[PDB]
Symmetry: D2
Subunit: 260 residues, 4 copies
């Protein structure tokens, strides 16, 4: 099942969409400069692009490290991004009351992994009618995603994207099960599946190999963070990186699926 | 480090404290029936007791499934449990705004495991000054608990309990690392550590073996949800009394 | 099901048996010296004791680490240990052809974890008729142990001990599932289950807590690869294990 | 580091090599039939090829279960494969004494995953001087592989292939950590790393997606079994390999990018 996001077609058999951006919105000018670089590189390579940032990063290393600009100023900045670049945007919500104001501005609203079973939030998100990105908790299996999906459907919203971010593998370590992509496709009605490579690892050097492995399984999109300069990609390496992802994606998508 | 909760002393070298009650509050009458039963059994066995219940089911099977009595009704029921029996109570909080009102009534406020790293909730809970029970996320190592403890300390609250509830072990399964109790005691200043045997399990046949194994490591309390409770606690008390009767090697 | 090992009764409802000694046999004199210490401490506490050592260790940390005195001298040392102390002994075997001669002297023969599925060794071990200690691989679930038990039963030997050593938990880390003990008892006909506490340890400092946790689940024995427990803390350690085991074993199963 | 296996160059920046065959040797006629299919398909696809089979299944669930033709019959069958097709072959060895006899005939000898820590088998295999395939145990980390490599090096053999086959994930389940390939290359001197997709899997349907994911990380080879649950149906080999070759060719055509 495909989802239309303005003029973008998101689907497991369409050219991959980059959900790309930064961790926390904490500025106007710098946000715009980083977005500008994403837009320039993705336009150059012809890759559909959705800008990502959180306005409230609620799980930070220290309690007084900056949470971000917050909802009201964050939405102002997202409005500027859309008016300048003409692209869709994505951001996460944390409480039901945020869902309406965020959804009026942002094309995709995201359910944080740690809140993915919070029924009140799921219902409030569903009722916006907005496209939703569901972050898969590291402690949840791929077959258990249908249960979150069912809840969204019961509440009247089937415009859902499932986002892989790795699975707990012993202490303080994540593994990405490449077989989980297929399980999610087969058990949740072939909804768009995307891959958060940034939150799947702890080391920067391995991002390309891990991203290519995931995209080899035939996915709707790649979800990453960069920094203007730990796992975030150096922004200057974006073009070299995306050249490789596009190469593989273009190959994989050009062939029809082979049933075993 | 010991924590005083009314007349109860909670600490890793004190007689274990039982935390128990219901999953979700359904009514005042059934709440008082269950709590009276725990009080009766724990009293005759001589085990300190803190009544546990949540006023809200945050995760529910259907979007239309029953959701508990909610904050206002829930706090009313707790107020009366405290009146009737004169025991401390414990409940979980999910939103920062809930903390101060819930903290007025409930002696211990609990940080859900799913929300353990949510900075806003940590600060709001700390600010109440109440005793706090920190559920260890299944995806978090014992040595990383010190970072959550550090946050509560920066926010000015050191009346902290650490609560084991198992660790992710492949898909859809939990294992309890019995070595994690000692690592938490060693790295988090010997704060009270308790064991949620119920949410560590899958099936109930194994609750006794698991509870005994955990309490053999020398813990402040046990957290759970024929007279099976009685039979169970007789055995836990025997082991706890033995373990705590020996000097720490 | 209980297993008689000379004058010892080994079983999940009997006083726990200690299995311990040295890693590899080198000399009669040094073996007797270490064994004598275990015997004295265990006799002082009234704990049954089976002396353990390898005569030919096949899974050494380095290729040129000493393998042990070998089969011939190793069995002579075992004979002397049995004659001097009047206790049973246990050793590992990794070659089918070794099983018969080793079983002539050693009361319990042990199947290394890494050979646990090797049919030829299982068959040769079973055919000795001796008591066998099955070391559970860290990658094998407790419900899969019944298949190993089945292969021994097919080969005509039911005198089996199941030895827990922890399970793989991500990378370079082991966890002991305390629920696995009960699963092995229920699925494997209540064969004696013993706990190799040393294998999964991060640090020697944690041995006591981990040993006590496992023994709380009601087990036939405790197995030491003694990180290693310092032999001078052995008495104080065993005082605590016996305290717990005596308490648990004295109460009838629920 | 590359490894020459007769005319084949095996290495992490070379065209992938297929290590392909069957579970166990059952008879000569069946073995030649299957091998002939592998050879015909790989030759026309231009994929280097090494035939795989075990001569003994040492760990079956029943002591009565069928175990294969055995060592003596097995080696004879391997000789006929090498004569008929002129390709290298690979088989596993479970006991030290079998190593030199097996290595006379079999170009690559394989250390079984279960026996990784069997020090006498390591030494016996190393002494043969043959190319060695090390099956990565499900219970060993990619950074623990250096320890086995070290032993082989101490024993005087550096022609080692590292073969991923998944990692233990809870009970009775495997997960392949796609980051482990990189860790092995970086910590074990860039020895050839290959991927056993077959023993990594519980379910047949997923073999192509998993194989593609692994090969996307830039590998020396793919290791797989066919049948005429997890083994690939033999008739699908050509279509399967068309896809694997397409990806490998793409990945290998772009320079390595550091991050
Ligand atoms: Cl995110
Ligand atoms: Cl998560
Ligand atoms: Cl959790
Ligand atoms: Cl093992
Ligand atoms: Cl041993
Ligand atoms: Cl194989
Ligand atoms: Cl393995
Ligand atoms: Na919108």
């Amino acid at each position: 099942m495909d989802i239309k996001i303005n003029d973008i077609t998101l689907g497991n058999n369409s050219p991959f969409v980059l959900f790309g951006g930064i961790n926390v919105l904490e500025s106007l000018d710098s946000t715009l400069q980083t977005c500008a670089h994403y837009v320039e590189v993705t336009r150059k390579l012809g890759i559909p692009y959705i800008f990502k940032a959180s306005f409230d990063k609620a799980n930070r290393s220290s309690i007084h490290s900056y949470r971000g600009v917050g909802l009201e100023e964050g939405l102002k900045i997202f409005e500027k991004v859309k008016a300048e670049f003409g692209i869709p945007v994505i951001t996460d919500v944390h409480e039901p009351h945020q869902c309406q104001p965020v959804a009026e501005v942002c094309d995709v609203i995201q359910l944080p992994a740690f809140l993915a079973r919070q029924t009140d939030l799921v219902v409030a998100m569903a009722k916006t009618g907005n496209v939703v990105n569901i972050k898969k908790p590291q402690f949840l299996s791929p077959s258990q995603m249908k249960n979150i999906v069912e809840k969204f459907h019961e509440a009247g919203n089937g415009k859902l994207i499932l986002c892989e971010r790795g699975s707990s593998f012993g202490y303080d370590n994540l593994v990405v099960d490449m077989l989980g992509f297929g399980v999610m496709k087969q058990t949740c009605g072939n909804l768009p599946v995307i891959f958060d490579v940034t939150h799947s690892l702890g080391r920067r050097a391995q991002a390309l190999d891990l991203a290519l492995a995931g995209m080899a399984t035939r996915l709707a999109g790649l979800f990453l963070e960069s920094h203007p300069d730990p796992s975030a990609l150096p922004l200057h390496l974006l073009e070299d990186f995306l050249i490789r992802i596009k190469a593989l994606d273009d190959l994989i998508k050009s062939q029809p699926i082979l049933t075993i």
